[PDB]
Symmetry: D2
Subunit: 333 residues, 4 copies
């Protein structure tokens, strides 16, 4: 129902578009990318090394990108304030380039007639939402918002359930994360982040992440109670979170399993998964959950100190949450 | 000085043999491996995908393996009780096949004339030793011992320093671990451990490990205070430990850095390393430390709750510790 | 329609089973594998790192493996002459273990009541067949046959078309081949084939193959005119043939493209594919063609000397050809 | 003797610098790279994922990069015509950015006082030289020259020997090539070469190359007689050439081995290697040969039609040839 524009046709832009057409919850009507012409867009959308060939039809016709017979207007503007979203009918714009994450910069899309802007990344100052956690705090006065990061969307739903039931005193998170586009095939320049320049095929690479701290924004009672770090490893997709936390109320591991499984079947269905299967990362490729609790992999030292494991398709889970968030916003109009 | 036999000419058997000849601390005089004949041993020892070509000479001569001009008796026995270690002059035997890790099974080497046996792996019942941590507890009545695991040798020196200075109330460990010979190139059978059969090149694979619990055997005061788990990831060598612990006495992260650095320059020199450089895993390939604390990668939530990161070459550090252990044993005879 | 037993539930056994149910062309009614019990079979068949979760249902019930509601008798015999195929109603048996590839050994399945045996690998003595090339030479007198290799199934249909139209004077093939189960995660023992023991993740590994020579068996006119070799590279699936040949009749590259495309739309439809897209190996993952000609990738030096490139999913193409061969056999009785 | 500046401190720029300090044949006195400042250069030079830590000392002092006690002037200019090479005493400049490969663009270094320029890549118009093949055709009138590509340096020495002894009528080349810095970690934009944008970890990627045709420039008698293509595969370093050629004179494979071994021990020593060992790509990491003939890997169809295999460390062999070529140029002044 709501008509959507996508700024950037990178991994996130293309998979948000894919999720939109797969789920049908929103209608994509425009895309902007200065570095990718129409014929090339067709190729990049249709073929995907990680998620396979698109399920449906894609073609160029009359200067438009036509996906499942739905024509999409293509822009090639470097300056977001110059994109004519309004003339194309785009109401919501997904800001997925990674370089306009502030209110100031993302807000440029409004000048072109966009009504609201969803930043598909953390923002220094735009309000952040995580589906299943605080999305009900959204309201119509908000024209520029953020859907946080893939890792925060993994951690927050699980932290919510654990905190609601047992109370997190403090927690430290590690994420073992699949490689991304910001990394390098061989040792190359990454001036602000030296480790991240090192060859991605050859190395386990430690990295900082604000994702754990960010959970404190979407779950205010956990402000200051979580932090963490990441390791990048040479897999193409799917990542995993390891949350080590101290609990205030006693929590037998079997009681933890019960409340997570109950959450996965009710209010967080589709967002927080639960499995007891002997899974490995490839079993979550193209999985649309934000977070899937791995009952078998986690371990408790005692009833107050536990390590909890949750898998996430860092591409597909997040992409589908952007769509879900827009669908929720549209329902509130 | 002490003459050594190696059972199992694998990753660890070969690299123990390299360490012995590179350091000169022990003399290898016999090798048994029923799945590698003499001419094949020359090839497997000389060329190493991970650590490069052997620096030295290796050839087959008169039915012996000759390394740097030293002849080595070669056995081809499946049954360890049948290996004639005594005839070859092997006084200590490194049990590095992976399949004889109880005192009962490893003790078979005594029937062929070995005086002592060092199991290159955790043992359900053999006393375990970690160089720098409890090796001075070894005494001459122990004919069969264990050098623990690569992961225990990483965690224990660091845990020793943290516990000695601040005390560890409780800790949970994750290791991000390189692939090993027990894993599979593509999805295949592993009936006792289903996740471990899944393709190692494609997957992040959670795995159980007793390594953190074993730290409580080499540091008795930590008995019951540590446990953990592992993720196998697609790198051919070098692993990393992530220790999340609660301290009984408060420490600023700078205090922790100070005492670890001091330990690495003094009593744990060569065993525990310390760095502030922007390292990645390949920077530790062929590094002979048991453990190298990564000061920049770690993070503290508060003065009592911290995540400490330490790197280890799981092949090369451990192999050198096996040699160091035997040298220390021989000094006690 | 024909009822089928599978000996060995491995990459090929499982994917033959998956192809049978996906296509519906034969009915699997029995499976034997001593190293994978019933509950483990469910897991190994349902989850696949390479091809994703099975599209359908799989469970254990009443001692049977049930796939899409169809019950399958499960055997656990090490000795093929003891498998009761007849009692389970299996008429054809796919011998996919890799260790019974001679007529003498594969013939053991006839003792337990199977009528015909199809060896899913080259055989020293069983007649070999490639669908689209010589399958019409099959006849009802043949009780034990071979479906050749994945590489032979890629090369032969392409060779057939080129030879039929232009005449191959001589040809040399290279295949760049994905890793397989016979390879090793780290440098390990492979006594008959030393290079194949070297770590698969770390190495390009040259290997001998009789695949090109074997084309001269399924296309007798090409006996002695083709041979080749392979390079194993660190990808989990999908391989590619590079055929360099001298042609007797002049052949502009556009003429080669024309006759290959024509073949792909006619007698070889589903076996030999044709593309002009800018493809890479992952675009062929789960592609059921034996061979897909890459028009853009090949190159001609002149009208008589050309290099032709053809892609193949070595797992899925071959599996589907085993099923197609059995369906063809069944149509003759 | 000759003093050298390096433009572009990348894989080749850094390894040229390493090769220069290791061999002592030339003196590096200046480096330009606008994307790598002085402190970062220390780090990038000292640590190398592929070739390990620099053996020697490296530090920043007084605004100079100091390698083994030798100070190097550091420039940060995007525009090559603005680099003050003369002031720094740099007589020859290695042009290794990958973006100034024509004589007109590379000639910009003369404006800042360089005397000669060596392009570390093929050039559309600069004369190309391969050490051991046509470097004696260099003369003092050539102020801007090219060292060709890594692949051309592998193929040309081998082709010289084969052509000299047996005569190459025609040949077709495939190179199975390690990934490079121009490739992408995950599917991303490569608008001119779509396949090259596809994830390098996940894919075998076909690519065009002028390397075989270029052999016809450095060996004029082979003009028009060779072409070829490449497959990029997921390994971080070391590549291999597969040369399929028709010979005019009969050449038993043992005779081919004889004359290649002879060349490797005499006129082409240090450039063309020869092995009969069971090698794999990692055995050539940091190998300084341009080309190493793999006797056991090649195969003959008959006396006039053969496939010859040669390995090359695409980073390290080539970097050493750049240094060798500059020292030879200096000897002609
Ligand atoms: N690889 C590491 O990082 C590492 C580190 C610490 C400890 N370990 C442990 O060392 C031991 C060996 O591990 P690995 O990585 O070297 O494995 P590996 O497979 O590379 O080597 C084991 C070997 O022993 C041989 N062997 C098998 N059965 C034998 C028998 N009956 N008699 C004699 N030889 C036999 C095999 O042919 C092979 O060479 C294991 O217990 C392992 O858990 C490994
Ligand atoms: N994987 C490919 O790309 C491919 C392609 C074409 C042909 N092939 C051929 O198919 C055959 C199987 O190859 P794979 O890739 O599936 O290897 P695999 O290791 O995955 O399969 C072998 C299976 O056979 C089982 N097995 C072993 N011994 C057995 C016995 N006595 N009785 C019953 N089952 C037994 C094993 O448990 C295993 O599951 C080989 O001959 C191979 O050359 C493989
Ligand atoms: N890597 C190989 O295997 C190999 C082998 C032979 C030749 N080459 C060729 O050598 C050249 C460099 O290749 P590479 O693999 O080292 O790539 P690279 O990306 O690792 O290095 C390029 C370097 O040049 C720098 N640079 C970019 N623009 C610059 C500018 N205007 N001025 C100064 N520096 C600039 C970059 O920061 C980078 O450090 C290319 O032409 C390549 O084709 C590469
Ligand atoms: Zn306190
Ligand atoms: Zn036979
Ligand atoms: Zn019938
Ligand atoms: Zn000084």
């Amino acid at each position: 129902k709501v008509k959507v524009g996508v700024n950037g046709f990178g991994r996130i832009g293309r998979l948000v578009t894919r999720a939109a057409f797969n789920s049908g919850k929103v209608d994509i009507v425009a895309i902007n990318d200065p570095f990718i012409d129409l014929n090339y867009m067709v190729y990049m959308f249709q073929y995907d090394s990680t998620h396979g060939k698109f399920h449906g039809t894609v073609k160029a016709e009359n200067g438009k990108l036509v996906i499942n017979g739905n024509p999409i207007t293509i822009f090639q503007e470097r300056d977001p304030s110059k994109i004519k979203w309004g003339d194309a009918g785009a109401e919501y714009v997904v800001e997925s380039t990674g370089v306009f994450t502030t209110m100031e910069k993302a807000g440029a899309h409004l000048q072109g007639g966009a009504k609201r802007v969803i930043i598909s990344a953390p923002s220094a100052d735009a309000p952040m939402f995580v589906m299943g956690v605080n999305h009900e705090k959204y309201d119509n006065s908000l024209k520029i918002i953020s859907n946080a990061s893939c890792t925060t969307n993994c951690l927050a739903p699980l932290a919510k359930v654990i905190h609601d039931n047992f109370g997190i005193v403090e927690g430290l998170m590690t994420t073992v994360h699949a490689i991304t586009a910001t990394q390098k095939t061989v040792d190359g320049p990454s001036g602000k982040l030296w480790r991240d320049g090192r060859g991605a095929l050859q190395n386990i690479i430690p990295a900082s992440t604000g994702a754990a701290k960010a959970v404190g924004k979407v779950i205010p009672e956990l402000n200051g109670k979580l932090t963490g770090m990441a390791f990048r490893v040479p897999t193409a997709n799917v990542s995993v979170v390891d949350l080590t936390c101290r609990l205030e109320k006693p929590a037998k591991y079997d009681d933890i399993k019960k409340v997570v499984k109950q959450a996965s079947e009710g209010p967080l269905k589709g967002i927080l998964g639960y499995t007891e299967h002997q899974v490995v990362s490839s079993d979550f490729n193209s999985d649309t959950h934000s977070s899937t609790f791995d009952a078998g992999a986690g371990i408790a030292l005692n009833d107050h100190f536990v390590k909890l494991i949750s898998w996430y398709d860092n591409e597909f889970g997040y992409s589908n949450r952007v769509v879900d968030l827009m669908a929720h916003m549209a329902s509130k109009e």
